[PDB]
Write a protein that binds this ligand. Structure first.
Ligand SMILES: Cc1cc2nc3c(=O)[nH]c(=O)nc-3n(C[C@H](O)[C@H](O)[C@H](O)COP(=O)(O)OP(=O)(O)OC[C@H]3O[C@@H](n4cnc5c(N)ncnc54)[C@H](O)[C@@H]3O)c2cc1C
Ligand SMILES: Cc1cc2nc3c(=O)[nH]c(=O)nc-3n(C[C@H](O)[C@H](O)[C@H](O)COP(=O)(O)OP(=O)(O)OC[C@H]3O[C@@H](n4cnc5c(N)ncnc54)[C@H](O)[C@@H]3O)c2cc1C
Ligand SMILES: CC(=O)N[C@H]1[C@@H](OP(=O)(O)OP(=O)(O)OC[C@H]2O[C@@H](n3ccc(=O)[nH]c3=O)[C@H](O)[C@@H]2O)O[C@H](CO)[C@@H](O)[C@@H]1O
Ligand SMILES: CC(=O)N[C@H]1[C@@H](OP(=O)(O)OP(=O)(O)OC[C@H]2O[C@@H](n3ccc(=O)[nH]c3=O)[C@H](O)[C@@H]2O)O[C@H](CO)[C@@H](O)[C@@H]1O
Ligand code: NA
Ligand code: NA
Lengths: 386, 386
């Protein structure tokens, strides 16, 4: 046949499943993608005026401690030695971040040794016991104290969730967000970096295989009856929205979205670092990204006098908005279990598998999407394609 | 013969020359080393109580932009992904360092953008023009201003040189020591890291070759007549002290030395970072090293409750003291040119080549010692050993 497997969506989940079927099982794979490009939200592109690589669906930082995943992705791209570091703007000062000896010195006014900082945090947080906390605000204060909570956590959290922290689950904070050393590496994973030639080239390489066909600007729901009629026995891996697949018969799952305000400025350097969080309520955005600093190795291809920045705004996703993060209210959880039983039935009756962020109503980092795809391949698709 | 080449001293210069003759020319090499171990001042060892890797002749950080050197050293050891970062203690606060947007924010009290920081530095330094500066103090102030100079440069410099900065050459500062971004990577080189299994294992691997013989606890000047009588035609590469070789006939070359005060403390973490500079005159040492933090990848072999630190003191080298850094007074320069003519004559008459830090009265980083040895090998020894 012209194809042995259909994959709906070309995000990292779809690309991984397609590439494994193509290269490991020698199967013909048809990828159906609604957007004008491959890669899902990880896709990046050159900004036209400056040539700087930017993102339109969020900045993407790759990091993992999963060696299988790391070895896998390096078949398709090399990675730079980039290490993510973040700074936090509070009350006119840029603080070292996350909370550690650096921030503690800057905020409390003098140097605390590791042991002295441990003592300070015990003092500050003595007010509430974490076992007695009823919401996010209290759970935070129970761990780091009111001054730190009110300076670096309260307004930022309020902006991201569009909700007062007193109205959020104590379960949203599960560990001490304080380091007792000067290490400000943002991620803790064994492997980390950015694709040397950008995300678009990486993701394009994954789909570049003699056995893989890609159809862009194609909505599954508009072509599915025709495609499956060509080869009824070919399974489908669906990574589109779960609720939309079943015609919202159990209601609309709720998502957070993001607005991005992207500007080209007439300076070579706006903030001197890739990411500046804005922790104060007076700034409506949560953080500013300055894209050139994600690739300092590209400096003599970047303009000397221009730079691209992007401000990030958080809100509830309405009709038309890109769905990014599951909200997960108990109402949401409710209709999800209902959709899971529909999906499981659809797999057994129709050979349609559900995966990915949209297909399963679950936020997935890139390495987690890859791991999840590798697992579906190993445990389900190898059998279904014999 | 039992040897084709004699190398005096097993520092990185000696080891490199020995290993190239042994492996590339297939020659028998005898290495004569005065100390009880290989490696010169780069040698490291386990501290007995904790097992932590420490140095007794200064902390050693490897970094280079020379790819030939990098490829060379990786034949003998792998390197960690360690990146050196330093903090500067001034008036009870730990500052981000070197001077950049971080320090500038902490010191001047609020956040300066890259462009605003450039303006600030222009204002502060307007006082003296660098072309009009007569000493180190003025040259520094002419570049960064009095407040920055007096806080982070004056006392530190006074401690290292044991001299008032007003008495030092304007030529000691040659570029703007300020960054207009938040990058606090200490070194700017393409390649950087620490030997995965320590310096001792690395340097030992260089001398580990069927064609290489090593004699420790052996002073060249006590064995040379006997060794050269065994094979008169074998050249010598000498990396011992240049002036001592010629019986101080032109006087004693002057050096700075260092005192190290090493302590085991009953805490798992003393300062939460590998190196803390002490910029204030009230502290007699220039900086404190905490050795466990150079190898965070070794954390579950390190004790949970003990740590090794080391305080560093600078002074003029007297009899008995290890010579570390050339002073380079014009008096020193004078007798050096005289010793160079003696050395050049000794090469032509005796086939003794002079190289390395001590052999040439010149400070050399590890990669610079290697490059210099690779060059002597290529341009001199290949011919002299045919
Ligand atoms: C704002 C944001 C920031 C992120 N930052 C990071 C980060 O820093 N690090 C990290 O590791 N991960 C990050 N991620 C996650 C990253 O994007 C993952 O690669 C992604 O979640 C993987 O899941 P996926 O492949 O299922 O999803 P997607 O990327 O959503 O791909 C699904 C694809 O299916 C297509 N599709 C949908 N419906 C149809 C249909 N009917 N017909 C055809 N095609 C259809 C979509 O157009 C899309 O291309 C971020 C995600 C977001 C949203
Ligand atoms: C305090 C200090 C800190 C340093 N930190 C760094 C750093 O962070 N990064 C970096 O890249 N480099 C650093 N270096 C430089 C590093 O040690 C180099 O590897 C070294 O300078 C290389 O030069 P070399 O091989 O000639 O010298 P050496 O290391 O001095 O080796 C010379 C050898 O010859 C031996 N010798 C002397 N006289 C005789 C004799 N008569 N007979 C036999 N043997 C003899 C000595 O015992 C010694 O082993 C540091 C050096 C010092 C002193
Ligand atoms: C748990 C987690 O990592 N979740 C995701 C989050 O990470 P990321 O590192 O971006 O974390 P966020 O900026 O979203 O902060 C997470 C939470 O930490 C608190 N906070 C954070 C920063 C700050 O300055 N102040 C403050 O209070 C807030 O409660 C906030 O809601 O978005 C990334 C980008 O999609 C994803 O890759 C991550 O998987
Ligand atoms: C130019 C240079 O890199 N020289 C050597 C120096 O580097 P290293 O990075 O250790 O530099 P130092 O700490 O010795 O400082 C060099 C000079 O900078 C000024 N200063 C530095 C720090 C500070 O907090 N305040 C201040 O004023 C002083 O004038 C000082 O004399 O010792 C290392 C260890 O042997 C060597 O590898 C380097 O090759
Ligand atoms: Na508490
Ligand atoms: Na000036």
């Amino acid at each position: 046949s012209d194809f042995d497997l259909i994959v709906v969506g070309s995000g990292l989940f779809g690309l991984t499943v397609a590439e494994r079927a193509a290269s490991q099982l020698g199967k013909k794979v048809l990828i159906v993608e609604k957007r004008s490009h491959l890669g899902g939200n990880a896709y990046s592109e050159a900004e036209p005026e400056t040539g700087i690589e930017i993102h339109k669906y969020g900045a993407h930082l790759f990091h993992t401690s999963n060696k299988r995943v790391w070895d896998y992705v390096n078949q398709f791209t090399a990675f730079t030695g980039y290490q993510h570091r973040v700074f936090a703007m509070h009350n006119g000062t840029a603080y070292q971040f996350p909370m550690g000896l650096g921030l503690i010195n800057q905020f409390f006014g003098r140097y605390y040794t590791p042991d002295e900082a441990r003592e300070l945090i015990k003092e500050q947080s003595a007010e509430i016991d974490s076992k007695d906390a009823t919401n996010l605000e209290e759970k935070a204060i129970s761990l780091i104290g009111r001054p730190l909570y009110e300076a670096f956590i309260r307004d930022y959290t309020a902006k991201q969730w569009q909700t007062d922290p007193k109205e959020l689950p104590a379960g949203n904070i599960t560990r001490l967000p304080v380091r007792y050393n000067f290490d400000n590496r943002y991620f803790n994973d064994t492997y980390e970096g950015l694709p040397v030639d950008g995300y678009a080239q990486w993701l394009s390489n994954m789909a570049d295989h003699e056995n893989i066909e890609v159809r862009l600007d194609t909505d599954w729901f508009e072509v599915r009856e025709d495609l499956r009629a060509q080869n009824p026995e070919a399974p489908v891996v669906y990574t589109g929205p779960l609720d939309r697949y079943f015609d919202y018969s159990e209601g609309h799952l709720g998502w957070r979205t993001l607005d991005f305000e992207t500007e080209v400025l007439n300076t070579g350097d706006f903030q001197g670092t890739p990411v500046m969080n804005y922790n104060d309520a007076e700034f409506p955005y949560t953080r500013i990204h300055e894209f050139r600093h994600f690739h300092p190795e590209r400096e003599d291809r970047h303009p000397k006098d221009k730079t691209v920045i992007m401000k990030e705004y958080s809100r509830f996703a309405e009709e038309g908005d890109e769905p990014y993060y599951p909200i997960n209210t108990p109402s949401d959880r409710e209709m999800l279990f209902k959709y899971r039983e529909l999906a499981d039935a659809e797999t057994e009756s129709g050979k349609v598998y559900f995966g990915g962020r949209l297909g399963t109503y679950q936020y997935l980092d890139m390495h987690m999407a890859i791991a999840s795809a590798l697992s579906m391949f190993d445990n389900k698709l190898v059998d279904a394609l014999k």
